[PDB]
Amino acid sequence: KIEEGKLVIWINGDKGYNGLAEVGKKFEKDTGIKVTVEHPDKLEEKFPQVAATGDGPDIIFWAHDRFGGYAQSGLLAEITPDKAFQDKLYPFTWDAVRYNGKLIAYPIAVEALSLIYNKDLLPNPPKTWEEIPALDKELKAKGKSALMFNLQEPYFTWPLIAADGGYAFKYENGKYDIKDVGVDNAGAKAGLTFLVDLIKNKHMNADTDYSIAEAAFNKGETAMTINGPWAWSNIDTSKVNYGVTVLPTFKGQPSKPFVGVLSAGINAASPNKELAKEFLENYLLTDEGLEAVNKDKPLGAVALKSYEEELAKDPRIAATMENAQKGEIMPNIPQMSAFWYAVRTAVINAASGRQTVDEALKDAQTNAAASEELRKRREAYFEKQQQKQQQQQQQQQQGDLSG
Ligand SMILES: OC[C@H]1O[C@H](O[C@H]2[C@H](O)[C@@H](O)[C@@H](O)O[C@@H]2CO)[C@H](O)[C@@H](O)[C@@H]1O
Ligand SMILES: [Zn+2]
Ligand SMILES: [Zn+2]
Ligand SMILES: [Zn+2]
């Protein structure tokens, strides 16, 4: 319980928060209610820490994968859009924000990573990963590199890992299996190996992060990067002649991005739930609301039918979709937090050459399952204690005192 007269909204610093705030100023102008857009760091880690005290914003924006965990900890209010409003959004976007049969967020846009390339350096982009090392060496004769992307976040590395058969959680019998992690298999080991070889062989640098990769591409120093729709604003401004296309194949298989649906959840502790719903339904999720955000930082393939339709002809959104088709929409189950942390640690560890790919992926295999492991052992502990207590009492009733 923190606000009453106003809406505080959290969104990631790489998204169009300036357009979001514009929508806020329009909401204030019509309503009298002040809207404050914030973009703090690590907001997806910060939210569950602050919302569990009665602090935290009224509306949080993130990809849908985190919302399962938030919902499970009781942190999101159930949203109540009517059927008419639901028909305004593509059905599959609604499923991404369904947890235990309840709607826990409003979907905004579908996001997938793509290959972004400088047409002046590289008029034909490579179709496979395997040809990138030779391309990197060729480009050195011009003082350029082939490719730079964010190696610090497993999101950007996942598509190459999943290509030859890496997965998060096997879907089976209408259930995600959470002792069945696919980060340790041969296809995952082949993908990470190839990445680590690129790094060790100096085609890439292990400490390359989001902003270093961005700068290199937007200044014209690298022929390619890998990024989502949000990144296109800055490329336009740099004036680099760029195309957006299919991610390269690995071992003849498509790269498989983990697809995110940018979503808006309402804090369960918020005393402004109705204002938040009003804001989201009638201000943000309209052509004009999404136009404001989208013209700041592109959203991708938007959830709202009428506006997606207005953006239908953009070849960059087409490539986003093609990349989404070859990928999978992320699970939103509570275990996603642990999966990401485990894969982050493993990539960073293998990249720096501290652990082998084998050791690092085996470690992530354990780390991603360790939560359900603890739960199983906790159950067994109390069941065994109950058994011993039962058996000790039945043995103790070998004799009893009587008056
Ligand atoms: O790298 C792990 C990370 O991946 C995804 O986060 C993406 C997010 O979906 C995009 O909206 C964009 O902001 O980049 C992020 C990667 O830095 C997952 O959504 C997230 O839970 C996960 O930690
Ligand atoms: Zn700001
Ligand atoms: Zn309907
Ligand atoms: Zn090489």
UniProtKB/Swiss-Prot annotation:
<keyword id="KW-0732">Signal</keyword>
<keyword id="KW-0762">Sugar transport</keyword>
<dbReference type="GO" id="GO:0015144">
    <property type="term" value="F:carbohydrate transmembrane transporter activity"/>
</dbReference>
<comment type="subunit">
    <text>The complex is composed of two ATP-binding proteins (MalK), two transmembrane proteins (MalG and MalF) and a solute-binding protein (MalE).</text>
</comment>
<comment type="similarity">
    <text>Belongs to the bacterial solute-binding protein 1 family.</text>
</comment>
<dbReference type="Pfam" id="PF01547">
    <property type="entry name" value="SBP_bac_1"/>
</dbReference>
<dbReference type="GO" id="GO:0015768">
    <property type="term" value="P:maltose transport"/>
</dbReference>
<protein>
    <recommendedName>
        <fullName>Maltose/maltodextrin-binding periplasmic protein</fullName>
    </recommendedName>
</protein>
<keyword id="KW-0813">Transport</keyword>
<dbReference type="InterPro" id="IPR006059">
    <property type="entry name" value="SBP"/>
</dbReference>
<comment type="function">
    <text>Part of the ABC transporter complex MalEFGK involved in maltose/maltodextrin import. Binds maltose and higher maltodextrins.</text>
</comment>
<keyword id="KW-0574">Periplasm</keyword>
<dbReference type="GO" id="GO:0042956">
    <property type="term" value="P:maltodextrin transmembrane transport"/>
</dbReference>
<dbReference type="InterPro" id="IPR006060">
    <property type="entry name" value="Maltose/Cyclodextrin-bd"/>
</dbReference>
<dbReference type="GO" id="GO:0030288">
    <property type="term" value="C:outer membrane-bounded periplasmic space"/>
</dbReference>
<dbReference type="GO" id="GO:0055052">
    <property type="term" value="C:ATP-binding cassette (ABC) transporter complex, substrate-binding subunit-containing"/>
</dbReference>
<dbReference type="GO" id="GO:1901982">
    <property type="term" value="F:maltose binding"/>
</dbReference>
<dbReference type="InterPro" id="IPR006061">
    <property type="entry name" value="SBP_1_CS"/>
</dbReference>
